[PDB]
Design an enzyme around this catalytic site. Structure first.
Site, PDB file in Angstrom:
ATOM      1  N   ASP A 501       0.819  -1.430  -0.197  1.00 24.73           N
ATOM      2  CA  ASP A 501      -0.048   0.104  -0.063  1.00 24.73           C
ATOM      3  C   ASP A 501       0.904   1.336   0.122  1.00 24.73           C
ATOM      4  OD1 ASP A 501      -1.328  -2.405   1.126  1.00 24.73           O
ATOM      5  OD2 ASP A 501      -3.059  -0.853   1.480  1.00 24.73           O
ATOM      6  N   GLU A 727       3.201  -9.963  11.619  1.00 21.12           N
ATOM      7  CA  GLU A 727       3.244  -9.366  10.096  1.00 21.12           C
ATOM      8  C   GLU A 727       4.605  -9.301   9.596  1.00 21.12           C
ATOM      9  OE1 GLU A 727      -0.129  -7.084   8.470  1.00 21.12           O
ATOM     10  OE2 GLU A 727      -0.657  -7.113  10.522  1.00 21.12           O
TER      11      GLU A 727
END
Ligand code: GLC
Ligand code: GLC
Ligand code: GLC
Ligand code: GLC
Ligand code: GLC
Ligand code: CA
Length: 760
Positions: A501, A727
């Site tokens: 992103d 993550e």
């Protein structure tokens, strides 16, 4: 075998809030889920919760919400005096266990899953004398906290007046019923959902508001069985009753079935005989993690699936993405192949077919996000369901890995036409300049354009906004450059399509970084990514592309063609295989000629410039935005020449570029937009790391890949501890961030155990 792996992840806890969140809004405990079920359980944390498995976690369609701390907690009484027990409690792969010990009374409890909606608890009581048993529980009252600090004094009932939680006695236990709540971003119930407790022995149950007490007398040693079921619709409630009866008639068969299924996961999965015990334990963590993120069919998703995290703020219920799925299924092929296959089917089960009511112009398209509830455009009330974009395609690679393990040619035959249709879609809808080389982009969508198809955008200058539409207006505005920023919903969706992103390569850079870049002789317009619409011959709007051809995207398309050719061959379609090989070769040629920069020894995205270069390349490599993990995508995917691969590996192994404390992060140290805490401009994700190691190995550098894998194993924080898998990592410090119980990290940690971790 499972008993060798106690408490691999800390599954203890006593939640006090429905949203008992960590600092990033994820549930801060790690409940045990299995068999794709829609509820989970925690281990007791000491005296306050001993005798029960606290923290009933309900997956309310698309979110995880706690129901209770203590619920069906056992205390034992002898002539009016409570029996004083000491506690032993632990998790193993596939079960929770607790043992309560006193001199003359002992209780052993085993909790395993029995069906996709029901867990089973064995309560074995050993006693020389009669006893009075009491089970108690209480629904939570408080709404939300962040690391134990209430975010407000809101109550669950106050925040959701229609939730109307009600406990009722039943003949063989109790149930909790729930009213209909359509809180799109928080709590989703049908008005028919229930949590049922059924037991093998009669109990007298008394309800007082949101708490209950159940009582039974026993004459001595007794073993009882209890089922717990979260049922999300009336139809699920009806169907489960016969299953509950069968479980209580044959409880030992269900316990054994779970035991055996978990021995098989461990037998199939733990095949690296050179791994250390610590490395093996990481693989077990990954197996527990992926299996807990598995959901059985529910709502609009007619297949078993795997989500990025059952505990995640935005990753729970059965919310499924393609990108995560390709990685998930690659790993799960090696221990739970049945669910790997299902997860892939789930993604393709909403693939656009000819004549689609919403987007007939997108045949072959795979939605970015599917979930229990369909979008309003497809008749549901779900806010998550997303068709504004897809994700990068490693679909063929994933399908192939399942075949590599199962050798099932019918699986290839099943998936081949779906893979072909997706492949075809990229070439029709994501190739603005028609050169056979895709771009990331976005679909036609209500969020992106007006009723008449004019592209929406908002021009921001100071505190003034201007919502305009139309590509030619946008084009003027970019040319004039009198704005602080430009928000184009379709171009936001294109960033989502890339899967990274805020990556530097897509023009993301903060003000301070950009001011420095400009102050050092760069132009701010170097960071502007131009945008275009894609139209068919007859003028139909197909969608949008970045005016930029991404090197990872090209390399994944190479991969797609490569695996399709192999599948075509497997299926006896040699002329189709030939065409795919030819398309792969063309892409490789373009990647090596256009996207490799000899001067910096690396690969980069190229702009689609106003005219192509003389050599036919759409534009120059975008060297000025710096290096990223896309640079090794041609190695991972096998498109690179050996010479170019050799050049890239030297850059990867340079401590001044990517060979950091935790190596192979999302931007080189030299990238103008680098930040060690920026998700896609410095932090290390396990997928990109593993892609790097695989690419290195592919081009002769196994020895160096093995060394980086050892470095990761030693420097990645928390790896050998009992925390949930997250993550990403700070490349400079090894510090973890992200959602706990994160699937694709688990998947690539598993791959690393399989491919690269070993005893030193
Ligand atoms: O199968 C789960 C558990 O069942 C029994 O309690 C065994 O004593 C224990 O060793 C095992 O971990
Ligand atoms: O993927 C192989 C099998 O996995 C699961 O058991 C599914 O329930 C079944 O339908 C599927 O065929
Ligand atoms: O499979 C469910 C649906 O997926 C897609 O939306 C298809 O375009 C549609 O034809 C199909 O009914
Ligand atoms: O397209 C529908 C929705 O898709 C995704 O879930 C996005 O996170 C959300 O912002 C968008 O509104
Ligand atoms: O809200 C932003 C997010 O929405 C969706 O989950 C998209 O799939 C993801 O790419 C994006 O980052
Ligand atoms: Ca192109």
């Amino acid at each position: 075998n499972a008993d060798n792996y106690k408490n691999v992840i800390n599954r203890t806890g006593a939640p006090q809030y429905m949203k008992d969140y960590d600092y990033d809004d994820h549930q801060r405990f790690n409940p045990f889920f299995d068999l794709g079920a829609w509820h989970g359980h925690l281990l007791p944390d000491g005296p306050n919760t001993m005798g029960g498995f606290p923290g009933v976690a309900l997956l309310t369609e698309e979110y995880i919400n706690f129901m209770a701390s203590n619920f069906d907690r056992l205390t034992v009484w002898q002539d009016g005096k409570k029996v004083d027990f000491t506690l032993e409690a632990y998790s193993i792969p596939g079960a929770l266990v607790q043992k309560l010990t006193a001199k003359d009374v002992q209780v052993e409890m085993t909790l395993r899953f029995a069906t996709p909606r029901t867990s089973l608890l064995e309560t074995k009581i050993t006693s020389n004398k009669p006893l009075d048993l009491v089970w108690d529980g209480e629904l939570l009252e408080k709404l939300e906290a962040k690391e134990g600090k209430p975010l407000s004094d809101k109550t669950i009932a106050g925040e959701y007046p229609d939730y109307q939680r009600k406990i009722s006695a039943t003949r063989d236990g109790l149930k909790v019923t729930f009213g209909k709540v359509r809180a799109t971003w928080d709590l989703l119930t049908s008005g028919e959902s229930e949590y049922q407790v059924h037991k093998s022995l009669p109990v007298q149950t008394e309800i007082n508001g949101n708490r209950f007490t159940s009582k039974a007398h026993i004459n001595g040693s007794t073993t009882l069985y209890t089922t717990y079921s979260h049922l999300l619709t009336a139809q699920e409630v009806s169907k489960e009753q016969m299953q509950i009866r069968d479980i209580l008639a044959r409880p030992a068969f269900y316990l054994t079935a779970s035991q055996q299924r978990w021995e098989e996961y461990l037998k199939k999965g733990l095949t690296n005989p050179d791994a250390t015990p610590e490395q093996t334990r990481v693989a077990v963590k990954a197996i527990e993690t992926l299996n807990g993120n598995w959901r059985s069919p529910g709502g609009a998703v007619k297949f078993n699936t795997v989500t990025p995290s059952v505990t995640g703020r935005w990753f729970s219920g059965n919310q499924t993405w393609p990108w995560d799925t390709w990685k998930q299924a690659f790993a799960m092929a090696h221990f739970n192949p049945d669910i790997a296959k299902e997860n892939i089917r789930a993604v393709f089960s909403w693939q656009i077919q000819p004549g689609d009511s919403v987007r007939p112009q997108d045949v072959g398209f795979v939605p970015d996000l599917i979930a229990w509830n369909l979008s309003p455009e497809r008749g549901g009330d779900g806010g998550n369901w997303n068709e504004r974009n897809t994700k990068p395609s490693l679909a063929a690679w994933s399908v192939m890995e399942v075949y590599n393990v199962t050798q099932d040619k019918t699986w290839v035959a099943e998936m081949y036409p779906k893979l072909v249709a997706y492949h075809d879609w990229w070439l029709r809808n994501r190739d603005h300049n028609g050169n056979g080389v895709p771009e990331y982009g976005a679909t036609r969508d209500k969020a992106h354009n007006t009723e008449s198809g004019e592209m929406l955008f908002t021009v921001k200058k100071g505190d003034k906004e201007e919502t305009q539409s139309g590509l030619n207006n946008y084009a003027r505005v970019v040319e004039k450059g009198q704005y602080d920023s430009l928000e184009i919903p379709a171009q936001v969706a294109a960033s989502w399509e890339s899967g990274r992103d805020d990556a530097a390569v897509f023009g993301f850079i903060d003000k301070e970084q950009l001011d420095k870049y400009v102050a050092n002789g760069g132009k701010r317009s170097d960071w502007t990514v131009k945008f275009a619409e894609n139209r068919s011959q007859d003028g139909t709007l197909l969608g949008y592309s970045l005016l930029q051809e991404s090197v990872d995207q090209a390399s994944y398309m190479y991969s797609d063609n490569h695996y399709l050719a192999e599948m075509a061959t497997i299926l006896g379609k040699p002329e189709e295989a030939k065409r795919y090989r030819q398309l792969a070769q063309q892409l490789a040629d373009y990647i090596n000629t256009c996207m490799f920069d000899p001067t910096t020894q690396f690969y980069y995205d190229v702009r689609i410039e106003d005219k192509p270069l003389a050599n036919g390349c759409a534009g120059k490599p975008i060297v000025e935005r710096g290096k990223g993990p896309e640079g090794w995508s041609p190695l991972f995917n096998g498109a690179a020449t050996q010479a170019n691969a050799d050049a890239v590996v030297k850059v990867m192994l340079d401590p001044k570029e990517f060979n950091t404390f935790v190596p192979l992060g999302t931007a080189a140290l030299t990238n103008p937009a680098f930040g060690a805490d920026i998700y896609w401009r410095g932090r290390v994700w396990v997928d990109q790391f593993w892609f790097g190691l695989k690419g290195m190995e592919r081009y002769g550098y196994r020895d160096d890949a093995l060394k980086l894998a050892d470095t990761f194993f030693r420097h990645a924080k928390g790896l050998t501890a009992d925390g949930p898998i997250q993550e990403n990592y700070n490349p400079l410090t090894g510090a973890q961030q992200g959602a706990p119980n994160f699937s694709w990290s688990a998947a690539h940690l598993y791959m690393l155990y399989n491919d690269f971790f070993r005893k030193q």
